Amino acid sequence: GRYIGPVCRLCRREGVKLYLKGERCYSPKCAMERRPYPPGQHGQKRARRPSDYAVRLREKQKLRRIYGISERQFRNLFEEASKKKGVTGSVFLGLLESRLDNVVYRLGFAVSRRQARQLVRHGHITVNGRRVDLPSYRVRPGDEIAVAEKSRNLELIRQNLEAMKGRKVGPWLSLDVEGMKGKFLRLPDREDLALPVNEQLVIEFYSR
Amino acid sequence: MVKIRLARFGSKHNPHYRIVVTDARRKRDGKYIEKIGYYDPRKTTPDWLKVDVERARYWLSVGAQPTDTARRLLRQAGVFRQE
Amino acid sequence: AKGEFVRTKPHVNVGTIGHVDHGKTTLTAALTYVAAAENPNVINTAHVEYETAKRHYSHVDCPGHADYIKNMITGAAQMDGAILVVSAADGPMPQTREHILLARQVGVPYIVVFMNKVDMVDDPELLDLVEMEVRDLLNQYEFPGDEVPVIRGSALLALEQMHRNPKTRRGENEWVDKIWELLDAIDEYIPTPVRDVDKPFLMPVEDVFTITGRGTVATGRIERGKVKVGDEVEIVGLAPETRRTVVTGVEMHRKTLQEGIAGDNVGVLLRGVSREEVERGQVLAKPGSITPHTKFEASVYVLKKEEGGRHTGFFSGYRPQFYFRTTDVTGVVQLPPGVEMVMPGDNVTFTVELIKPVALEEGLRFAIREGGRTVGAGVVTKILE
Amino acid sequence: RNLSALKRHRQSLKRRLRNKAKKSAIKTLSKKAIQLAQEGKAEEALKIMRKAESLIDKAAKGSTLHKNAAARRKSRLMRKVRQLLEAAGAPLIGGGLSA
RNA sequence: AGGGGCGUAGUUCAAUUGGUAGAACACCGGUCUCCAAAACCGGGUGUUGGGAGUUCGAGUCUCUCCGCCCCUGCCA
RNA sequence: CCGAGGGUAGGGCCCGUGACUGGGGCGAAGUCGUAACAAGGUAGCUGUACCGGAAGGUGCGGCUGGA
RNA sequence: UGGAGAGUUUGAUCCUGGCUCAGGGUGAACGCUGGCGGCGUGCCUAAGACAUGCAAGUCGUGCGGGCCGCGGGGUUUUACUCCGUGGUCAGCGGCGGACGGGUGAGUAACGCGUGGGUGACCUACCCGGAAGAGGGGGACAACCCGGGGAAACUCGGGCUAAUCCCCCAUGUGGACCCGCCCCUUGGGGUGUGUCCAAAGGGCUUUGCCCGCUUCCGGAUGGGCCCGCGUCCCAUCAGCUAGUUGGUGGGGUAAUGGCCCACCAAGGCGACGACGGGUAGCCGGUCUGAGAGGAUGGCCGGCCACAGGGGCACUGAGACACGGGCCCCACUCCUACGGGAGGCAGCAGUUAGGAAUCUUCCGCAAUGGGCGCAAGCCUGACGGAGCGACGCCGCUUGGAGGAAGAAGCCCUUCGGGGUGUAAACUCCUGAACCCGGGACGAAACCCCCGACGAGGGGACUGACGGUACCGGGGUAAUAGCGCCGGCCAACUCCGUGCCAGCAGCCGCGGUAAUACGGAGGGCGCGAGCGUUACCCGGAUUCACUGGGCGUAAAGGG
Ligand SMILES: C/C=C\C=C\[C@@H]1O[C@](O)([C@H](CC)C(=O)NC/C=C/C=C(\C)[C@@H](OC)[C@@H](C)[C@@H]2O[C@H](/C=C/C=C/C=C(\C)C(=O)c3c(O)cc[nH]c3=O)[C@H](O)[C@@H]2O)[C@H](O)[C@H](O)C1(C)C
Ligand SMILES: Nc1nc2c(ncn2[C@@H]2O[C@H](COP(=O)(O)OP(=O)(O)O)[C@@H](O)[C@H]2O)c(=O)[nH]1
Ligand SMILES: [Zn+2]
């Protein structure tokens, strides 16, 4: 299940710093900032020119690790992404963005994705009225995601909703910092997601 | 004779029927001479019942024995309201 | 066409003992006809019974004889009291002492003595001289031999006038009455121990049957707690893994039982189990209570020769057979260092690893035998593995 | 151990006799007719044949024959007889076969 | 559950007069070789199925126990 | 009359098996030679026939994939 | 909207070619491990054998009795028990048990698929239309009584009722023979002759509701026939006497050598007859870029079978899964002359097997049979149970936290690694606690209105006190594989061609990224591997899409 284990360890290994921890993985110490190299007893030595295979794995893992999704859903979502009309690169990314917990984190609320998940698993999150607890919930157009009323006075929702004064949300999501709402105006685009992931490779990983 | 019953589709704890004109001797969900409507007994959808007419009456005007619930639904869709 | 079983009278089971061809097995085949004239309406141990108008009884008539010890024993522990049958002929003989000895190594309390074969040449100072030897014998063994209700009579003769008319009452025939003196002998003296029903559960397996149309049935006496139909149970003992099942049936002497209490001899039809998966020894308890263990540091007291035990002593690496609940295993022994001098009459503790997993729980008792004699008894302490 | 059904075997046996007889009757009567129609007995020929025909259509009343089974048995008579008489006889009794 | 059997090196088989238990062929250890095979020297390497028992000693004779084979048992 | 099945009898097809026997495959370090590979020490190969512990030899004709 | 290749012949090269791997899939099984839920799904083998219980009945408004509880004495008493209501045991009549449910043995064939034919046919109950429903007669059960028997039951005498049976009449009409007209294989009209009908039951009573009879039409469901399509062996090449055709019959709802006499001598075959092996066919399912290849489990259509085998009876329909007759094998009872039985229905046992479940609850719903109706029956069906057997969702926590504890592991002794990982701090609250708690169910029926349309009323929930909602609430599971190359991931020790690994290439003979253990890493995660089998890759049977001088391959 959704990994659960050392993460600022993948911050490393994939070689492209990540913040799966939010606060700290943002400080002068994302783990990377002290060992921009792979874990293990080796981790810091001559690297063979990565096999054309290795490359894609690395690209997929990179992308997938970024979300916390299990391989099963990931591929699954990718297959779906395929049939749907349009470019898989774009589409699949979009579908990766609709993931409730993701929107939860993409919209203040949660500092980390892993924390945006526990929020949805515990109920604190809500959608078009009725609350949803499935991280995999697939958000659509025009749906605002409000917090709950029993949480609003929680020590956490405060600070995390506090870092919202000033900062601006993605070009495809609004936000009523006061009355915790925020809608999902429209599916994100390739560009908007400034992600260190070469989608077309990840795609190629699923060809063979 | 040639009845007018309901064949259970949908799934476990999710009824959804199909108003059909089958030869009484078939199985409930077996083959069937023709379909003329559906019925979601749990309503859950503004249209849990919809049925054809010119055809319902047709089979009715040729010896098609409706069932208790079947006849009910037919009626409820203004099948016998002769005006 | 089965018939239920209803509780009213207390339940107690007992068995016969004596020298091979003597009185038992036939005494049994008579004591039954008695308690059957007024009610109920109508080589291998033979679980039977009889309902006196005073109590419910389950008779265990172990075939007896030598060679049949392993089987003899497993039945002795199942009873609260035994009927020591003795004949008027050769009188107290070898296997009459042997069975009695065992009885006093199984905890078997109280003994009812019934002299059979009296119908053979009435010797004046004999049926009065026989009881002498007996009582003295029960004493050479520490038994309460001096308060045992000794009654005489040719049991079988009480049967000829039964196997021709199943309606014989009391009084008539100084034989078929003669057998009511042994009933009012067990009705008295031999108590009725308290069987705790506040405990988990446990039924040592004795025999296993494949009842046609229903499946495997495990017969056994209850160690404690209770078990009715539809209760999850586990089979702990032998086997590679402890398999779990649901009790789909319970019966008392081929009669539907509505609820089993301790002390009861009941057959258990387990849901989905092969006659090859269950076997004597292993027990049936509540999922969770007790588990399986091969090694233990039990406290043991090696009997003294002058009382059957060894007269030499064993060195660490002695492989004997330990008796648990209803069966016997085998196991190497390791001494707690320097103690490589455990000889007769001694009393110590050590390590033992049975080559067959068996239910062990620390607080359980057992015996040790090798070479045809109980070399020592004891109790278990916390398990190693 | 048992059930209704039996009620069906008993009736079975009954109805069996009911038309087993009606049957072998039409048979012996169909024979006699021709057994004369080729004799020359035109008169006492169309007489029993007239009876036969009765018994045939009569059997059709019940579960004995019905439809063409009865209709057919008829032709192969009014054909077997009619084509047995015109072999030197002339249809006397205008009672039965059509003139 | 109860009878009757067989278990000896690495494997096939002897000592069945109560006496540390040997033959064959293998294998192992050196020597030569990178290492083997050959060749030359030199070795019984064995829980005598386990464990106890009589005893001056038990492979042989008692009992118990393990695995396997065989016959015969077993509807709460 | 027909008729399931049962007999007696003789065929066909398939499978199992048999003392013994034919050749085949495979198998770290066995025996005998030396056919072939370099006119491989008699160019080779080939159909056939006779012969020979064995590879093979020889005869007749053929091929060059032999100078 | 759709196509990826790699390893391996050599000292090296190019080519040919085989083997092997990476991807999907499975009614799965085996190993390690295992928390929840939803929807699925579960004897692939012995069509082996089976203890129990249950899978089909219902109508008294078709008809006559027995019997028990009771209006209340018939006569004035317990004698005509007449009568009256609801019951109740079988009987007689009726409709249904020929559907629904199981299985795949058999079948290579009009069995199936697809398209048609029938002037060669049938079709219970249901519809619309036409006309009728009048005289009469009789039987056998049940029951009383006698009898043989262990039983199952059987026989004899005698009452008796019908919607049972039979006779006459009526002939709207219909059937048959012959003539004629239209028409074209036997269809439709007509005329003379013959032949054929029928039941009364309940009320609320010159009327209705339920039935009845004959004909016509409609529906629906079927039978029979035909074209094309449907596996491997040619080391199977010739097969055939009811054989092929005819004539007249028998037979059938109906065509037909289907069956039979008699006559003719035919019919079939390399376009594969006959024979052997295997197999139920299809919609579809898996794979595939496609063309194809494989398959045919769950659901739906067709077929076939009901211990093995033959046969009919009843009936609209069966040669009939829980009907009958008989032979056989096996199961049991037996008072030894004859008796009972068939789980490939449901749940369960045993055997076989690598392997496949509960003797569960409910007719509440849908469907079904019988019923005027109430209602009864219904292991069809609706559900619950068991197994990660599959798919889908969910959990084992989130956020802080050191130039970085310990332990373990490496180390050029300075250090590096597992690692923000932990511990530690705040932190949300899977489970579980208390309370509330369904949708699935609105008709039949009752009242109004005529029992029609429409309007109103009442009963009814197996799953379940489950889902779901509210409030309370503890940090609470991790494994399996793999790390020489293919193929993502490397270091120490042990071992020393041993022990072992191995899908292919190949590793191991004292420094082994290849054995075994460890540290560390990689993949995936309630799973992860293994074995088996299908497609792919394999343009490696090549139609799409290959080849033959010397690689296999040109016939002398
Ligand atoms: C023995 C088999 C199974 C035992 C199982 C278990 O035993 C127990 O663990 C039990 C717990 C104490 C146990 O350990 N039993 C294990 C032991 C227990 C021993 C206890 C009591 C004693 O005391 C020293 C007791 C008999 C004592 O002996 C004396 C007898 C001496 C006899 C000498 C023999 C004589 C003349 C003779 O002719 C003779 C002979 O008999 C045999 C053979 N050849 C002979 O020639 C006297 O009679 C005393 O009374 C529990 O009861 C368990 O619940 C159990 C029943 C499952
Ligand atoms: N004379 C006599 N014979 C007896 C007596 N008890 C049993 N029997 C006989 O002993 C023989 C049976 O022995 P059994 O009952 O089997 O004793 P078990 O061997 O102890 O079971 C038979 O002949 C019985 O009739 C008795 O008390 N007196
Ligand atoms: Zn980080």
Main β sheet profile of chain D = none
Structural shape of chain D = elongated
SSE order of chain A, one letter for each helix or strand: HHHHHHH
Helix tally of chain D equals: 4
Short synopsis of the structure:
This is part of a larger assembly, with chains A (208 residues), B (83 residues), C (385 residues) and D (99 residues). Chain C has 385 residues and is mostly beta strands.
Which terms summarize this structure?
part of a larger assembly, 4 chains, B: 83 residues, alpha+beta, S16 Ribosomal Protein, Chain: A, 2 helices, 19% strand, D: 99 residues, mainly alpha, Methane Monooxygenase Hydroxylase, Chain G, domain 1, binds kirromycin, binds guanosine-5'-diphosphate, binds zinc ion, RNA-binding, ribonucleoprotein (chain A)
Describe the structure.
The structure is cut from a larger assembly and holds chains A (208 residues), B (83 residues), C (385 residues) and D (99 residues). Chain A contains 7 helices and no strands. Chain A has 208 residues and is mainly α. Chain A folds into 2 domains: 7-96 and 194-207, Ribosomal protein S4/S9, N-terminal domain (Ribosomal Protein S4 Delta 41, Chain A, domain 1, Orthogonal Bundle); 97-184, RNA-binding S4 domain (Structural Genomics Hypothetical 15.5 Kd Protein In mrcA-pckA Intergenic Region, Chain A). Chain C is mainly β and 385 residues long. In chain C, strand 12 (231-236) and strand 13 (244-252) form a beta hairpin. Chain D has a single domain, classed as Up-down Bundle (Methane Monooxygenase Hydroxylase, Chain G, domain 1). Chain D starts with 5 loop residues before the first helix and ends in a 14-residue tail after the last helix. The chains hardly touch. Zinc ion binds next to loops of chain A. Chain A binds 3 RNA strands through helix 1, helix 2, helix 5 and helix 6. Chain C: One of its GO terms (molecular function) is translation elongation factor activity. Chain C: GTP binds at residues 18-25, 61-65, 116-119. Chain C: Belongs to the TRAFAC class translation factor GTPase superfamily. Classic translation factor GTPase family. EF-Tu/EF-1A subfamily. Chain C: Keywords: Cytoplasm, Elongation factor, GTP-binding, Hydrolase, Magnesium, Metal-binding, Nucleotide-binding, Phosphoprotein, Protein biosynthesis, RNA-binding.
